Amino acid sequence: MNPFASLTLTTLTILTIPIMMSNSNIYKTNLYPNYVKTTVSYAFTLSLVPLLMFMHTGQEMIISNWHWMTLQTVELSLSFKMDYFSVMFIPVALFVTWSIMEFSMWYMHSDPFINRFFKYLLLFLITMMILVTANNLFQLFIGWEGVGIMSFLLIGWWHGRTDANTAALQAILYNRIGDIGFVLSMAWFLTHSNAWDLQQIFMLNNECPNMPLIGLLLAAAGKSAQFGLHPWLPSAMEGPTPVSALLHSSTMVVAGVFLLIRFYPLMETNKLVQTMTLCLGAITTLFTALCAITQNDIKKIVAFSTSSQLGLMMVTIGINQPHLAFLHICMHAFFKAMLFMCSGSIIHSLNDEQDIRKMGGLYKAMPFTTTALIIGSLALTGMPYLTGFYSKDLIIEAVNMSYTNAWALLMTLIATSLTAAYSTRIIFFAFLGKPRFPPLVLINENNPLLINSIKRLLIGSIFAGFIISNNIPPMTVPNTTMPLYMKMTALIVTIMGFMLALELNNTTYYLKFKYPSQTYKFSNMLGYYPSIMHRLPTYHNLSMSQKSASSLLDLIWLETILPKTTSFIQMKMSIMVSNQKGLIKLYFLSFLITIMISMTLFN
Amino acid sequence: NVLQIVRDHWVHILVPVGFVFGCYLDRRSDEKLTAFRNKSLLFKRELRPNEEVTWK
């Protein structure tokens, strides 16, 4: 046998191993975080090997190892799809998870349940690998709901915090609407194609219809926090910073984009769903960047950046470029994870402070995190030869050179400018200027765990784009010929965003005070979407649940119709029958009437 | 003493002997339904040299 299947399954299995050891003296000791981190490192190397095997000859396989059950003519089995997407995303996810686990070993040092934290991180990684490698819709759904519930558990890490509990339930609610879409798609595919596996689905759906493709689009919007279903992702910043860095921003929110990428044959066949995907992505990226440019919480700014980048990926899928979307998934994983880790380092060094209004002077106070965050923000905005150039620049070129929605193209360009803008805001308000933090300076970023984790994710944010771009096969025809101004569109809008944001931020020093604008209030309060749409529909649903269902119907009218009315009638008739004075005159007269009636009316 | 244990734990044989009696009654019920034994069109065959019935 070739080592491809063995090594892929080995990576997955050795990921599962430390969960088995979560009932041992090692789980009772303080070596468990280091044990889990070492396991993830070894899994990362063993995943690097089949990536080299694919990068040579483009080797892909499917492994239907275990047969689960046969529903007459439908066979469900445990099958894994080890193709380009899986063998590229597994090493990236493992690398990011390894760095995040080391940073969490430093960051969650005082947590009484750090071992449980690491077990939960490993469980999320397992579910995400199941999602990515799944070859059938049922196993994909297992991974889907697994990452959803692990996100729920990790957001509500501090159970005494009411805000944390509301954020966890909110994430569940939005992902559950997404799951409504997912289940609609599963039912359609089984009913009309007799299969839940991608091979038969692709073979039988020569032209996929609107109903299954819109089901998939709705599920992806829910899982990837697109507009309409977006507010849960910024609200998921209640959990510990390692959770925000690993789960949401880098590896879990890309689940919807990955779902849409995995069905790119059907997506190619359809066109209306492509238009809907493009428009949804465009409005998501614009709206979330616009909300980001004015937030004062660093984690919130990074979360809205994540939503904006996901919108960009959804735009890329909508222009019939699924492989560019996957490339952006990988590059964004790298630099967004690093940005979240730097934000967490700043938060920890300033006594759990997350307000850029109280950060300041950190350029010189914290050298290594300063340079790491600068490199990450440059890579995010598309510096000409960093890891974000090889995906975002090509995405912008493809959007400009396609038969696209004009409004979608305009919103995409404006969103690129706003990306530069809010990256400028983070840097300007956190690192430049005079200090604003309380006078007891506890700044210390000299821990080897923190430095090494950021260093590993920092090398990737510089060179990994070049390596990956030059080692993957050409899966799309390039845009070789285009106007020079259209070639330089991304750089021009990025620099314009930098300059305008810098001017606006420098204006803050003037001794001039002006009341805020309506546009400022709209952007700062998230477009008023969480207020209106978290107070009105919830209030009406919870009011109907009691006034109409519980009280009016169950306690009042369903009780009155059958059992209350019947009981009342029987009681009244009983009173009528038994209310007799016991007078022989009366009931003998009754006997006489009965005898006459029987003689006359019976023949 | 030993007598008290039997005096106290004689009730632990009731369910086992009930299981044995139920198995016996199941066999008795089976032996009254032997009207098509070796007579179904699908399973009718010749008797082996040293067997009297196909099933009990």
Binding site: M69, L71, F138, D179, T191, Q546, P563 | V11, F21
Partner: protein, 459 residues
């Protein structure tokens, strides 16, 4: 089936002859042994049923239900011995006698091969349940709950007796095999409509159908813990088993008569989930969740396709296990604080961690989390409903969202937050309670490992 029936009737004299302090030990051990023996019924056939004799037979639909009944008896013994410490020996033995009689009636109900013997046993299950509720319930409302339960069931089931004797006079037999092989189409006439109504209404009341369900919150809230466990896990499934069995003789009239019941089931599924969202009582929340799941099972039986029956069987077994476990968890909380209000006891995760884990697992199974058999059954029903019509997906998705909402609401309310300050008697969880939860939850995941054992005869 006698090898399983006789050991129960021998549990009776053993219970009455054992010493005063060995009743719980003897009953639990020998119930476990009888459950192990009943595990042998799962070796079913692909063509026909296991025709033991003229009186009893077993199928892929009966066998999991029998295994669930036999497994549920020792768990009920454990919970009962929790809450019946101060009782006299005679009354403890009477309680165990009621439980054993209920198990015997349920076994003979699932294995009865005639519709009339099935009717006699399925109506005989009412007496032990009513006695248990109205005698060993705690509150005043146990009497009214027993009245509601009894009279709802009997009003449903008496026209069923009339219809069964009428069908015996018409066709000569009530044997299930004969009525399956000699079935004829039911013509569209008023007489046939009312025959259909008699049968289906009996089992719809037993299910319960939405609008015929008030007896369920009344009885499940006011019964003792063993009564609650058997009412939700097994007694609700007599309706599903009966509806699956009796619809052999009701075609093609089921195609036209199922619209009101499907509409009631789908809309009432939505309505009972929404009720669960706003319940101030924990036991009532679990009861209304039971109503929603049984509404889904009714939809499956009424649409009546090979994929819907498998989902119905899987969902019935899964709901039995999950609802029994949820009732046990709520009962442990009640035995701590002596109140059923949901917001009275909070912070139970920081007071009792392992019970918090049990709550998490039970609530994760209550909502359909893959690959649990709860999800398997729900998904098969949803797929069959999608083939029936394409807006059933809308109603089903709404129901799944609300189910997740109220399940996690219950978990967050009871376990998370900060503990009530003045409740200073939350003693550490007992080994008995922990073992009860483990024995509830491990079989569910093993059934996930082997799912063909609970998918019914249509598999």
């Amino acid at each position: 089936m006698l090898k399983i029936i006789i050991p129960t009737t021998m549990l009776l004299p053993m219970t009455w002859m054992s010493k005063h302090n060995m009743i719980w030990i003897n009953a639990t051990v020998h119930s476990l042994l009888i459950s192990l023996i009943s595990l042998s019924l799962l070796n079913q056939l692909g063509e026909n049923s296991l025709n033991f004799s003229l009186t009893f037979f077993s199928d892929s639909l009966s066998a999991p239900l029998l295994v669930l009944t036999t497994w549920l008896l020792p768990l009920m013994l454990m919970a009962s011995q929790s809450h019946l410490s101060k009782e006299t020996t005679t009354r403890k033995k009477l309680y165990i006698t009621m439980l054993i009689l209920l198990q015997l009636f349920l076994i003979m109900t699932f294995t009865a091969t005639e519709l009339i013997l099935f009717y006699i046993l399925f109506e005989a299950t009412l007496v032990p349940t009513l006695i248990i509720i109205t005698r060993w319930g705690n509150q005043t409302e146990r009497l009214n709950a027993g009245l509601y339960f009894l009279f709802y069931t009997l009003a449903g089931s008496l026209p069923l007796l009339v219809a069964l004797v009428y069908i015996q006079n018409t066709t000569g037999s009530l044997n299930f095999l004969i009525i399956h092989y000699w079935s004829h189409p039911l013509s569209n006439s008023w007489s046939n409509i009312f025959m259909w109504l008699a049968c289906i209404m009996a089992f719809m009341v037993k299910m319960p159908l939405y609008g015929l369900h008030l007896w369920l919150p009344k009885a499940h809230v006011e019964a003792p813990i063993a009564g609650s466990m058997v009412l939700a896990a097994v007694l609700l499934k007599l309706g599903g088993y009966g509806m699956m069995r009796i619809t052999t003789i009701l075609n093609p009239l089921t195609n036209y008569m199922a619209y009101p019941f499907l509409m009631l089931s789908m809309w009432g599924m939505i309505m009972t989930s929404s009720i669960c969202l706003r319940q101030t009582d924990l036991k009532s929340l679990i009861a209304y969740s039971s109503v929603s799941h049984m509404a889904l099972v009714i939809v499956a039986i009424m649409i009546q396709t090979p994929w819907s029956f498998m989902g119905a069987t899987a969902l019935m077994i899964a709901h039995g296990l999950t609802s029994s476990m949820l009732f046990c968890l709520a009962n442990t909380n009640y035995e701590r604080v002596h109140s059923r209000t949901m917001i009275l006891a909070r912070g139970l995760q920081t007071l009792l961690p392992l019970m918090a884990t049990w709550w998490l697992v039970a609530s994760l199974t209550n909502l359909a989390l893959p690959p649990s058999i709860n999800l398997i059954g729900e998904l098969f029903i949803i797929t069959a409903s999608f083939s029936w019509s394409n807006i059933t997906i809308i109603l089903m998705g709404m129901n799944m969202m609300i189910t997740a909402l109220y399940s996690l609401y219950m978990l967050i309310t009871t376990q998370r937050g900060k503990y009530t300050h003045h409740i200073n008697n939350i003693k550490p969880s007992f080994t008995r309670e922990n073992a009860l939860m483990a024995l509830h939850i491990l079989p569910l995941l093993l059934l996930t490992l082997n799912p063909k054992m609970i998918l019914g005869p249509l598999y």
